[PDB]
Design a protein around this nucleic acid. Structure first.
Ligand code: FES
Ligand SMILES: [K+]
Ligand SMILES: [K+]
Ligand SMILES: [K+]
Ligand SMILES: [K+]
Ligand SMILES: [Mg+2]
Ligand SMILES: [Mg+2]
Ligand SMILES: [Mg+2]
Ligand SMILES: [Mg+2]
Ligand SMILES: [Mg+2]
Ligand SMILES: [Mg+2]
Ligand SMILES: [Mg+2]
Ligand SMILES: [Mg+2]
Ligand SMILES: [Mg+2]
Ligand SMILES: [Mg+2]
Ligand SMILES: [Mg+2]
Ligand SMILES: [Mg+2]
Ligand SMILES: [Mg+2]
Ligand SMILES: [Mg+2]
Ligand SMILES: [Mg+2]
Ligand SMILES: [Mg+2]
Ligand SMILES: [Mg+2]
Ligand SMILES: [Mg+2]
Lengths: 38, 18, 51, 222, 94, 122, 43
RNA sequence: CUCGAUGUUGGAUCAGGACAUCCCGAUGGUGCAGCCGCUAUUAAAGGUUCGUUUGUUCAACGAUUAAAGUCCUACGUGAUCU
RNA sequence: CCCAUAGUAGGCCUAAAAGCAGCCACCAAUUAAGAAAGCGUUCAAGCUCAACACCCACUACCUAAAAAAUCCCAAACAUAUAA
């Protein structure tokens, strides 16, 4: 097996991959784009 | 086939005292 | 009016519930009379039996 | 009527007597005899030392973990000293000299036969550490170019920063976490062992919180 | 299909669960006499009886526990008072 | 190393917003949980396998009633990721000896004491 | 062409696995159940 | 993986394939005047010698050639040979 | 985009140093133009930039590839109400 610190980006366990996907930053989206208002 | 070296650290085989 | 201004599906307008309640009673009465007058031949049924 | 604005003044600023970066030795003056374990945790996770500005206003900020050998120090010194203005600029090292011994086995030998002899020394660096700090009677625009050139040549992700840009970086990350609209965050799930997730996570992830993977730092992770 | 919808109406997610479709007798004698109860329905009836009885046992045990602790606290408070009484002080205060 | 997980106590402190979302009353806590296993114990540490047995949750999708007390909750927290916890609701009160045999546990968590299998005349 | 060295899902070089939309929804669905479990264990 | 056997160098024979092009084709740049070169892009249809010594692969040398390319194919190929 | 005169080749050192090898100063003419930011000249010339005038450029200020050997490799599809 490979050590916890590697030169390459180590592949993640699939469950961890899913965790990352589900916890991504979602920015606050305004109802009306601010450029479309006075 | 290259001829290798040996470890210079002996001893250190004591078991746990419990 | 553009290709995406409105949804692709057509607009559906359902009947007025009051008017439809009267239409439903007429349909039920018509089918009921067919039973009373025996205007049916062979019948089939879907029965739940043994799971 | 093009509108001029007041130019910043550096009258109070004072340039040290030795402005240029000093020479960094390949190995410590007294050679280390005891061979040490690999200890890869020394480049893992957030840095706790040399994270803040001291004397200068500009620096190179580490965005990953890595080891700096003597070759890197020479690149940094020669590039910065050649490019800097000694009269108006000064540079200091924010990293110690190579001190961690790296062993190597002789070429062609099999596995076993004891640990290898010490070959060279390295300086461990963690993400978030200032590597070189510059100051003097100059603006960030003046030093950003050659500082960015040096940062690109480092064995880890790095970027030239200033007191202003560094603080804005931190404020932006705090704002993203506060205004994040995702109800689920790595910290909440991991610390509560939701889904039994800790069976695929390291104990370090309770404090890394999904921002660090091996030696790599993910700045866009909240 | 429809499991989530059934749950929203207070029904079992699976239509094979509780309800008239499953529990009602499958058949009866043509004359009118009812059929002996189905074996699966008898098992379900017994299963539900044990669950209800456990619900009553767990509840009663929890009530008795709360009443026992409430009686222990009441006694403890009463005991403190009795210890206060003693002989009358004398000396400088008299 | 993978070990048992200590859950911070703050995880089990409900906020006012939580009470609105789920509809529980902090001043009138429910007496009994309805607990159902919804996740296998395969590929889980042995200590989690053993608690599932202790709680009578060996068979999945089979509701079990348990007392809502600290000791029981301590076990439930170890296996919280394997189960669904809902409060037992008693809209017509506790079953009596007369209606012991006519109870049904609905999917809403309400234990009804009459089960007629008839439509509502209302 | 396009071989994965050694065995597909082990070792240093692996076949990349991607997270589908429904895989995400499955995980979120169970996160909601556990979040509610937290609540009912608080009283 | 194979030791109840997957015959082990170089050569002969026949070659299949890659292009990171030795020659031939088409282009950009040049410290490209021209003649010769250097470097890069594109091109794998076709082609890519004979000898002295050495078992040699290589290497040296002689005489040539538009050029005497780099590699993979169980260091291609012994139920085809040596 | 547009446009550039002048104390003056500031002194110093230097065979020569004229904004632009080095050292010191970095003041001033014209409404406006650094004792000069980048090229260039043996030294000069010569071409730009920061100026004025003109006047809505009404700038993004996050980066960025690919090559192997028998023959690519499911077929396909941006549009009908989350199941
Ligand atoms: S779409 Fe509203 S300002 Fe352009
Ligand atoms: K780098
Ligand atoms: K592999
Ligand atoms: K063998
Ligand atoms: K000069
Ligand atoms: Mg092994
Ligand atoms: Mg390991
Ligand atoms: Mg010991
Ligand atoms: Mg021992
Ligand atoms: Mg394989
Ligand atoms: Mg055999
Ligand atoms: Mg061929
Ligand atoms: Mg090519
Ligand atoms: Mg061979
Ligand atoms: Mg033979
Ligand atoms: Mg053969
Ligand atoms: Mg002048
Ligand atoms: Mg002069
Ligand atoms: Mg001068
Ligand atoms: Mg000059
Ligand atoms: Mg002026
Ligand atoms: Mg001039
Ligand atoms: Mg100009």
């Amino acid at each position: 097996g490979s050590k916890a610190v590697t030169r390459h980006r180590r592949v993640m366990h699939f469950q961890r991959q899913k965790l990352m996907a589900v916890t991504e930053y979602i920015p606050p989206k305004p109802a009306i784009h601010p450029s479309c208002l006075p | 086939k290259k001829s290798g070296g040996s470890s210079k650290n002996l001893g250190g085989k004591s078991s746990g005292r419990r | 009016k553009t290709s995406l201004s409105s949804p692709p599906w057509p607009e559906v307008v359902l009947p007025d519930p009051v008017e439809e309640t009267r239409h439903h009673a007429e349909v039920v009465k018509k089918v009921n009379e067919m039973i009373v007058t025996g205007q049916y031949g062979r019948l089939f049924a879907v029965v739940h039996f043994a799971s | 009527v093009k509108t001029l604005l007041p130019v910043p003044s550096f009258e109070d600023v004072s340039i040290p007597e030795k402005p240029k970066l000093r020479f960094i030795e390949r190995a410590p003056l007294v050679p280390k005899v005891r061979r040490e374990p690999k200890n890869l945790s020394d480049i893992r996770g957030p840095s706790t030392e040399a994270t803040e500005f001291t004397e200068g206003n500009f620096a190179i900020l580490a965005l990953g973990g890595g080891y700096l050998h003597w070759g890197h120090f020479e690149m940094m010194r020669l590039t910065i000293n050649r490019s800097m203005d000694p009269k108006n600029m000064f540079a200091i090292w924010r990293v110690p000299a190579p001190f961690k011994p790296i062993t190597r086995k002789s070429v062609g030998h099999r596995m076993g036969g004891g640990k290898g002899a010490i070959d060279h020394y390295v300086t461990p660096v963690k993400a978030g550490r200032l590597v070189v700090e510059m100051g003097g009677r100059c603006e960030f625009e003046e030093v950003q170019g050659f500082l960015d050139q040096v940062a690109h040549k480092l064995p880890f992700a790095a970027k030239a920063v200033s007191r202003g840009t560094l603080e804005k970086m931190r404020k932006d990350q705090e704002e993203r976490e506060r205004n994040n609209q995702n109800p689920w965050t790595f910290e909440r799930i991991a610390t509560a062992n939701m889904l039994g997730i800790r069976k695929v996570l390291s104990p370090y992830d309770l404090t890394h919180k999904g921002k660090y993977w091996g030696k790599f730092y993910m700045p866009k992770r909240v | 299909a429809g499991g989530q919808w059934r749950l929203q109406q207070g029904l079992a997610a699976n239509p094979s669960g509780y309800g008239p479709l499953t529990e009602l007798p499958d058949w009866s004698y043509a004359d009118g006499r009812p059929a002996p109860p189905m074996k699966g329905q008898l098992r379900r009836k017994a299963e539900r009886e044990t669950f209800a009885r456990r619900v009553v046992l767990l509840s009663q045990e929890m009530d008795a526990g709360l009443q026992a602790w409430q009686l222990r606290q009441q006694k403890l408070q009463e005991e403190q008072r009795k210890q206060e009484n003693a002989l009358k002080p004398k000396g400088a205060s008299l | 190393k993978f070990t048992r997980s200590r859950i911070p106590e703050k995880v089990f402190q409900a906020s006012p917003e939580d009470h609105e979302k789920y509809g529980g009353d902090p001043q009138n806590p429910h007496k009994l949980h309805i607990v159902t296993r919804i996740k296998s114990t395969r590929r889980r540490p042995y200590w989690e396998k053993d608690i599932i047995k202790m709680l009578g949750l060996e068979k999945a999708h089979t509701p079990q009633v348990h007392k809502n007390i600290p000791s029981v909750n301590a076990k439930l927290k170890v296996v919280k990721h394997l189960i669904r916890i809902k409060p037992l609701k008693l809209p017509q009160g506790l079953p009596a000896e007369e209606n012991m045999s006519n109870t049904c546990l609905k999917s809403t968590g309400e234990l009804v004491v009459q089960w007629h299998l008839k439509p509502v005349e209302q | 062409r396009g071989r994965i060295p050694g065995r597909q899902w082990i070792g240093k070089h692996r076949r990349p696995r991607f997270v589908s939309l429904r895989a995400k929804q499955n995980m979120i669905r169970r996160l909601e159940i556990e979040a509610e479990n937290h609540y009912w264990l608080s009283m």
